[PDB]
Ligand binder design. Structure first.
Ligand SMILES: CC(C)CCC[C@@H](C)[C@H]1CC[C@H]2[C@@H]3CC=C4C[C@@H](OC(=O)CCC(=O)O)CC[C@]4(C)[C@H]3CC[C@]12C
Ligand SMILES: CC(C)CCC[C@@H](C)[C@H]1CC[C@H]2[C@@H]3CC=C4C[C@@H](OC(=O)CCC(=O)O)CC[C@]4(C)[C@H]3CC[C@]12C
Ligand SMILES: CC(C)CCC[C@@H](C)[C@H]1CC[C@H]2[C@@H]3CC=C4C[C@@H](OC(=O)CCC(=O)O)CC[C@]4(C)[C@H]3CC[C@]12C
Ligand SMILES: CC(C)CCC[C@@H](C)[C@H]1CC[C@H]2[C@@H]3CC=C4C[C@@H](OC(=O)CCC(=O)O)CC[C@]4(C)[C@H]3CC[C@]12C
Ligand SMILES: CC(C)CCC[C@@H](C)[C@H]1CC[C@H]2[C@@H]3CC=C4C[C@@H](OC(=O)CCC(=O)O)CC[C@]4(C)[C@H]3CC[C@]12C
Ligand SMILES: CC(C)CCC[C@@H](C)[C@H]1CC[C@H]2[C@@H]3CC=C4C[C@@H](OC(=O)CCC(=O)O)CC[C@]4(C)[C@H]3CC[C@]12C
Ligand SMILES: CC(C)CCC[C@@H](C)[C@H]1CC[C@H]2[C@@H]3CC=C4C[C@@H](OC(=O)CCC(=O)O)CC[C@]4(C)[C@H]3CC[C@]12C
Ligand SMILES: CC(C)CCC[C@@H](C)[C@H]1CC[C@H]2[C@@H]3CC=C4C[C@@H](OC(=O)CCC(=O)O)CC[C@]4(C)[C@H]3CC[C@]12C
Ligand SMILES: CC(C)CCC[C@@H](C)[C@H]1CC[C@H]2[C@@H]3CC=C4C[C@@H](OC(=O)CCC(=O)O)CC[C@]4(C)[C@H]3CC[C@]12C
Lengths: 243, 148, 49
């Protein structure tokens, strides 16, 4: 909570503080020396503003609102058609990607070790940082392909769609803060291993049936990659109620 | 169920936005896009995969029912990704969030059952006093007891 | 069978997940304390600062 009393109906008060700056001054702030957690050891209005905007909960909600607005914008630029040049919303999205990449680079530079390879390693030890770097590189290559002419523009749009898949999956990072949603998310991540073993056994049985069906119903076939597709196509959708 | 609906909403909107933005490149701003985000992915949870629209044959020439040569519309770019991300979405949703909701329903069943039985036994008094304080005559005939 | 293995490992995973989330609260809090005030779309001003 930083230098803020509150502790009553959390989230909403700091959201109205963020959207409405004149709602900040109507909140009960904590004393000057009640619990001063520090890193290195009109005026009251400015002090209240500075204490509110440096609180970690306010920074978190303000990050969350920026991410939600960015995701809504990137929805608007993937759903609506795009011209030869990007629109304003696409420029805001591209700016968001570039600044997030610069932020991740600054986080790489401001870490514990001395050697740059050690910093890179301790930063890539987190999986979300690796997926962030991969997604930023994919957005870069997709935007480069999109600023050219056809047929590279459609390829850039496709890469944009795969990136939107990633950013929806990354919304679970914001969900990780709630006391019930975060344990739920990492619980899902734990059950992914059992699902993988299940997928292995399903893959064996599915490929057996698909190969048998395709090799019985289609005797005279030339070598073509459509046979491999027909192995997996119908048996997979038979699991989900479509026989 | 609400937390389950939240996670389903995230995964459902991801797949629906991806499918709509791949299969329909040239679209004007219209509220039908938001409907198409939610329409097919939601009914895919309940055993309807819309098998005619998983991967329709396009970009070739196929004879019709009368035998006339019919030219299919050309392939959209990246249209092969829609069945793959559909496979991933169907697997994740139907196999993981439903079974995880089954698990959280099962492992919290006993405490909820005991608390529910005890709370019902407590609220028996509220029910009994409420029905004791109500008039004799039913709601369709309570105007007589009200004027009384 | 996946339902069964999901059900019979639910309690241990739930306890470990709750405890690991309570441990990672510190990582979240220090990370958000070390981040700049300005959001990612406006972080170029704090970066030039
Ligand atoms: C803080 C969080 C919770 C919400 C912040 C996000 C919204 C304030 C943004 C995100 C997407 C935005 C929309 C994206 C695209 C458009 C189309 C845009 O219209 C055009 O571009 C065509 C006509 C014109 O040029 O004005 C008008 C604004 C609008 C509705 C935007 C209005 C503001 C929206 C809803
Ligand atoms: C910080 C980000 C991640 C979210 C913040 C939300 C708002 C500050 C943004 C989101 C969508 C934006 C809108 C998206 C599109 C337009 C249309 C745009 O219209 C034109 O530019 C028409 C003239 C021209 O073609 O140049 C005017 C700005 C506006 C309303 C934007 C104003 C600022 C908005 C509301
Ligand atoms: C439209 C289609 C492609 C849907 C996308 C499916 C997958 C790309 C998504 C769906 C659910 C996601 C999972 C949801 C939850 C988690 C837990 C989370 O991991 C943690 O919180 C770390 C701790 C732990 O793993 O227990 C992020 C990864 C993971 C496995 C996610 C990995 C990516 C998954 C499988
Ligand atoms: C055991 C379970 C958990 C996983 C095994 C199933 C998947 C590995 C299969 C099922 C459906 C398959 C897809 C079905 C159809 C296609 C389209 C195909 O592209 C085309 O046919 C080109 C377009 C056209 O000709 O219409 C490329 C392979 C792909 C993505 C397949 C890739 C492999 C998939 C995802
Ligand atoms: C233990 C499990 C994982 C085994 C699964 C094996 C099959 C899924 C693979 C193994 C060998 C594959 C075949 C190897 C070679 C070819 C030839 C290939 O022909 C061409 O590409 C055309 C040649 C040309 O004109 O250039 C078409 C796919 C096919 C039949 C492959 C289809 C898929 C097969 C049967
Ligand atoms: C091991 C588990 C945990 C994950 C599942 C992995 C495989 C089952 C997947 C991953 C990549 C897939 C392949 C990706 C691409 C293709 C090409 C695809 O070719 C076509 O569809 C040709 C176009 C046409 O003729 O229509 C046929 C399916 C195949 C071999 C896929 C078969 C299924 C594969 C091997
Ligand atoms: C994650 C899960 C648990 C919930 C998410 C799914 C719903 C939020 C979606 C799925 C189906 C959607 C509906 C599908 C179709 C319509 C009809 C639509 O009306 C029309 O299209 C007008 C009539 C016509 O044009 O035919 C209005 C939105 C609505 C009710 C949609 C509202 C949003 C719904 C209920
Ligand atoms: C974090 C999650 C909840 C994000 C989900 C975002 C999307 C579901 C929203 C955000 C912005 C919305 C768009 C904002 C503006 C418009 C323009 C709007 O155009 C009109 O109404 C026509 C204008 C006219 O002629 O009056 C049609 C809906 C659409 C595309 C909206 C469709 C749904 C979008 C993409
Ligand atoms: C957060 C969880 C717990 C509940 C789910 C809430 C949302 C996912 C729902 C609630 C209201 C829904 C909206 C209600 C009305 C519409 C208008 C509807 O517009 C049309 O169908 C236009 C008519 C046409 O063009 O056919 C499109 C779906 C949409 C945006 C719905 C999208 C899904 C929404 C946002």
């Amino acid at each position: 909570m930083g230098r803020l009393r509150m502790r009553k109906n959390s989230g909403l008060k700091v959201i109205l503080g963020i959207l409405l700056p004149p709602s900040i001054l109507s909140l009960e702030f904590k004393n000057k020396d009640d619990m001063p957690y520090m890193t290195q050891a009109l005026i009251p209005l400015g002090r209240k503003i500075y204490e509110f905007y440096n609180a970690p909960i306010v920074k978190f909600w303000f990050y969350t609102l920026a991410y939600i607005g960015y995701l809504m914008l990137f929805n608007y630029i993937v759903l609506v058609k795009m011209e030869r040049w990007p629109s304003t919303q696409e420029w805001i999205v591209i700016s968001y990607i570039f600044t997030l990449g610069i932020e991740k680079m600054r986080e790489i530079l401001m870490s514990e070790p001395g050697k740059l390879l050690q910093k890179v390693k301790v930063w890539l030890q987190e999986y979300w940082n690796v997926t962030d770097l991969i997604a930023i590189l994919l957005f870069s290559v997709g935007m480069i392909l999109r600023l050219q002419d056809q047929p590279f523009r459609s390829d850039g749009r496709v890469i944009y769609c795969v990136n939107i898949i990633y950013w929806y999956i990354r919304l679970l990072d914001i969900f990780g803060v709630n006391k019930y949603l975060g344990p739920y998310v990492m619980m899902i991540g734990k059950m992914m291993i059992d699902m993988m073993y299940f997928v292995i056994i399903m893959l064996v049985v599915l490929m057996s049936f698909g190969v048998a069906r395709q090799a019985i119903l289609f005797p005279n076939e030339e070598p073509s990659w459509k046979l491999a597709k027909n192995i997996f196509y119908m048996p997979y959708w038979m699991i989900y109620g479509e026989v | 169920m609400m937390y389950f609906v939240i996670i389903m909403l995230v995964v459902l909107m991801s797949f629906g936005v991806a499918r709509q933005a791949i299969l329909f490149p040239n679209e004007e701003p219209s509220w039908k896009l938001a409907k198409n985000i939610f329409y097919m992915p939601y009914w895919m949870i309940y055993g309807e995969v819309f098998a005619d629209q998983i991967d329709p044959p396009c970009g070739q020439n196929e004879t019709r029912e009368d035998g006339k040569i019919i030219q299919l519309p050309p392939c959209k770019t990246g249209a092969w990704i829609v069945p793959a991300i559909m496979a991933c979405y169907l697997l994740v949703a139907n196999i993981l969030l439903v079974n995880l909701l089954i698990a959280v329903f099962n492992n919290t069943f006993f405490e909820v059952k005991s608390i529910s039985n005890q709370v019902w036994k407590f609220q028996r008094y509220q029910l009994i006093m409420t029905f004791h304080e109500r008039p004799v005559l039913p709601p369709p005939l309570i105007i007589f007891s009200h004027m009384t």
